[PDB]
């Protein structure tokens, strides 16, 4: 009963949430996770993703200078009123490093416009790219209209979708992701602190991601933390205060590290199984996985994980191509299959 117990989830003071393992993708806990909500500033996570992808392809670098224009003039556009701004003025020449830090640490809205034009030519074009990555990531409940989150009646996202975007950031664009743990940056004589309070929380290892709020949206936070080793991502949307969005995320991440752990039972290229092959240049096929296997299981239960496999066909006949799928690996706890992954040919077997 103690071995097999399923932990109760804490009550979370928020309209929606999700908690997932970053490595495995497992949803440890969720409430209203696909409901469409106003993402507010969590939109800047996609802005930052596009910028991170552009830098990864080498289209520009952190030291490069961006000349500010009229659309990024903070007090030249009342759309920016009451919002967070770097106070960019036309003519300024600002290193990319300082503009992405305005975006990531400060949620500077004028910074988003400057980087958007620089990166994609116009805001409409950049927004096209945001939504192109919405499609490529396979997000079912997200649409962007702006580069910042302001002035967008038809923009939406979800606790699940925002957590997936967090994952993409960490996974796809890690040089861009590591900026999110920086607690302060200086721009134009003025020291600006990271809005994500949980960075200062000494009981956890939070290193991201993004914060957000409107009287529409309520209070939103996407957070990620480590213990090891294990990485968890939480998205809480429509929390009730600033204090607030942080306290509720803390409950989720702590609960997650307490009751669950992440195992990596098998790597790419490492042989899990061997099977005889007919017609081939070798007698046997080396069988395994084309993707590193990560599982989230109840904490403590690592020594109880049993792995086995099934084959799709009675016989294996050459030619066999690399990563050809030929079966399924079953991971089990307590006699029951908890996870499956494709069984693949690790090395191509040409015909004799």
Curated annotation (Swiss-Prot):
Enzyme class: hydrolase
Catalytic activity: Preferential cleavage: (Ac)2-L-Lys-D-Ala-|-D-Ala. Also transpeptidation of peptidyl-alanyl moieties that are N-acyl substituents of D-alanine; a beta-lactam + H2O = a substituted beta-amino acid
Pathway the protein takes part in: Cell wall biogenesis; peptidoglycan biosynthesis
Keywords: Carboxypeptidase, Cell inner membrane, Cell membrane, Cell shape, Cell wall biogenesis/degradation, Hydrolase, Membrane, Peptidoglycan synthesis, Protease, Signal
Compartment(s) of residence: Cell inner membrane
GO terms under cellular component: outer membrane-bounded periplasmic space; plasma membrane
Documented effect of changing residue 102 to D: In mutant dacA11191; inactive but still binds penicillin
Binding site for substrate: 210
BP terms from Gene Ontology: cell division; cell wall organization; peptidoglycan biosynthetic process; peptidoglycan metabolic process; proteolysis; regulation of cell shape
Top-level taxon in the UniProt lineage: Bacteria
The keyword Membrane is annotated on this UniProt entry: yes
Molecular functions (GO terms): beta-lactamase activity; carboxypeptidase activity; penicillin binding; protein homodimerization activity; serine-type D-Ala-D-Ala carboxypeptidase activity
Function: Removes C-terminal D-alanyl residues from sugar-peptide cell wall precursors.
Homology family: Belongs to the peptidase S11 family.
Protein name: D-alanyl-D-alanine carboxypeptidase DacA
Organism the protein comes from: Escherichia coli (strain K12)
């Amino acid at each position: 009963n103690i071995k097999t117990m399923i932990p109760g989830v804490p009550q979370i003071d928020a309209e929606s949430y999700i908690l997932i393992d970053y490595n495995s993708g497992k949803v440890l806990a969720e409430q209203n996770a696909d409901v469409r909500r106003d993402p507010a500033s969590l939109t800047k996570m996609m802005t930052s993703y596009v910028i991170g992808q552009a830098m990864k392809a080498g289209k520009f670098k952190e030291t490069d200078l961006v000349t500010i224009g009229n659309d990024a003039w903070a007090t030249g556009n009342p759309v920016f009123k009451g919002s967070s701004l770097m106070f960019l003025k036309p003519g300024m020449q600002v290193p990319v490093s300082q503009l992405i830090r305005g975006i990531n640490l400060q949620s500077g809205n004028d910074a988003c416009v400057a980087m958007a034009d620089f990166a994609a030519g116009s805001q409409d074009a950049f927004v096209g790219l945001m939504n192109s990555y919405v499609n490529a990531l396979g997000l079912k409940n997200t649409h962007f209209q702006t580069v910042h989150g302001l002035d967008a009646d038809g923009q939406y996202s979800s606790a699940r979708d925002m957590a997936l975007i967090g994952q993409a950031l960490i996974r796809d664009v890690p040089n861009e992701y590591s900026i999110y743990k920086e607690k302060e940056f200086t721009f134009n004589g003025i020291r600006q602190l990271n809005r994500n309070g949980l960075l200062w929380d000494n009981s956890l290892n939070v290193d991201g991601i993004k914060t957000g709020h409107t009287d529409k949206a309520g209070y939103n936070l996407v957070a990620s933390a480590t213990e090891g080793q294990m990485r968890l991502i939480s998205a809480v949307m429509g929390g009730r205060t600033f204090k607030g969005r942080e306290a509720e995320s803390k409950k989720l991440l702590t609960w997650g590290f307490r009751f669950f752990e992440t195992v990596n039972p098998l790597k790419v290229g490492k042989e899990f199984a061997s099977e005889p092959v007919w017609f081939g240049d070798s007698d046997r096929a080396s069988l395994g996985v084309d993707k590193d296997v990560y599982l989230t299981i109840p904490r403590g239960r690592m020594k109880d994980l049993k792995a086995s496999y099934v084959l799709n066909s009675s016989e294996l006949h050459a030619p066999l191509q690399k990563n050809q799928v030929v079966g399924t690996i079953n991971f089990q706890l307590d006699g029951k299959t908890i996870e499956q992954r494709p069984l693949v040919v690790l090395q191509e077997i040409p015909e004799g």
